From a paper:
ApoE4, a major risk factor for sporadic AD, has a stronger binding to HSPGs, whereas the protective variants ApoE2, ApoE3Ch, and ApoE3 V236E (Jacksonville) bind less avidly to HSPGs.
We first synthesized peptides corresponding to the N‐terminal HSPG‐binding region (amino acids 114 to 144) of WT ApoE3 and ApoE3Ch variants. We followed standard procedures to obtain hybridoma cell lines secreting novel anti‐ApoE antibodies with high specificity. CDRs for all four antibodies have about twice as many of the acidic amino acids aspartate and glutamate (D, E; 10 to 12 amino acids) compared to the basic amino acids arginine, lysine, and histidine (R, K, and H; four to six amino acids), a feature that may be critical for interactions with the positively charged HSPG‐binding domain of ApoE. None of the newly designed antibodies showed any binding to mouse ApoE compared to anti‐His tag antibody used as positive control. Using binding assays, we confirmed that the library of antibodies differentially targeted the different ApoE variants, thereby offering a novel platform for targeted therapeutics.
Residue numbers in the entry:
A (entry chain H): 1 to 133, 141 to 218
B (entry chain L): 1 to 215
Write the structure that this text describes.
Amino acid sequence: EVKLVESGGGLVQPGGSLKLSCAASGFTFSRYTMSWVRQTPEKRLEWVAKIRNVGGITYYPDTVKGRFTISRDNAKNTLYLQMSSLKSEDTAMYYCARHYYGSEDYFDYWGQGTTLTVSSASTKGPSVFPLAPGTAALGCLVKDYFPEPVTVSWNSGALTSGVHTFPAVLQSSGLYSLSSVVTVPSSSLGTQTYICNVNHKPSNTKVDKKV
Amino acid sequence: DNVLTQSPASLAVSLGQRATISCKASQSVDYDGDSYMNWYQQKPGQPPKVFIYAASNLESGIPARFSGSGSGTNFTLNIHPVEEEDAATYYCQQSNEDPWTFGGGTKLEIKRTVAAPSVFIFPPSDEQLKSGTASVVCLLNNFYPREAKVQWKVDNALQSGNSQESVTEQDSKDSTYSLSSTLTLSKADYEKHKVYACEVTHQGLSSPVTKSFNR
Ligand SMILES: *[C@@H]1O[C@H](CO)[C@@H](O)[C@H](O)[C@H]1NC(C)=O
């Protein structure tokens, strides 16, 4: 099974630098042409960089040429994107993508992405509050964090049925907030324990909140 | 750059009917008898996934209801008959010339029968009130269509300017949406009042539904 795993994203000041990594497994990495593709907050997809399986030949769009460097370490099965003189418009989810062998004319595998935020705003961890409860509803309010993203699970990933984690909303303050909710049998309220697990990696925040 | 323009930007199609999405390129993507336009599907929280490559070829593992056509500057993705799991955003992408470019995406909504929301209201927690802020939450669960009116009332007075809404992406199984509306008050303001009510108007509701609590 082919797998690509991006890492290294984070919050960077405008004008700063950051290097992303993509760990490749399940195929002969050296035989493949590889690209980075990013997706802006507006959901626009932008090809960012390409490195061929031959000659270390690299290609870039004019928007990043001179600031971004793609490279590869075939012995360690790793792809890299070094970014410098970063701009607000570079804020995006960054994906590692493999080109179909031979004709190389489409992306046949992608990683799950790593998030880059270019901003002068400070990191802020979330506050997690309970939404306390036929069917009953309950949940967790994840409020006032920056930057995106946050992850929310229930009972460590055992409880997924009936779970809705809402897209974050940007408040006028510049901080994000979201809720995660779950519906359960109102009879199970007495016996069953419900814990929301919140992760905000940019602030090193891991919280479990019992509802 | 070869700028790609998709139309429409969003599309709603009944179950079992045909979805047609177009992509126009600013210059031709033909080379030596093939046309280098790809189509990708993207679902929330996932990377895009290729469905069609070089205008008309299905990727291995793709259902037969998907097909691609066109050449030069004009391409079409067809889905027929659409299924619930086809709710997604679809992107075209040209590979004829560097830089590779993507269209802006078309979101496909799958139409279903009207489904009324189940409505829930949540008071602010004691913990948060300590911070001097009160967030009151109203949940509208598993409804269709997306259009809904959520009004906050406080001691029966209509609120404006102090709430925000968030809506889930369409469910891949049953084609519904859920929605949250959060009302944000100061502690002082919150404690000035007794009755907090969320009133919901929706096509599936025989009349507006109010959920409320007393502080
Ligand atoms: C592009 O294709 C669609 C149908 O495939 C059609 O409606 C439209 O007229 C075409 N545009 C041109 C310029 O041929």
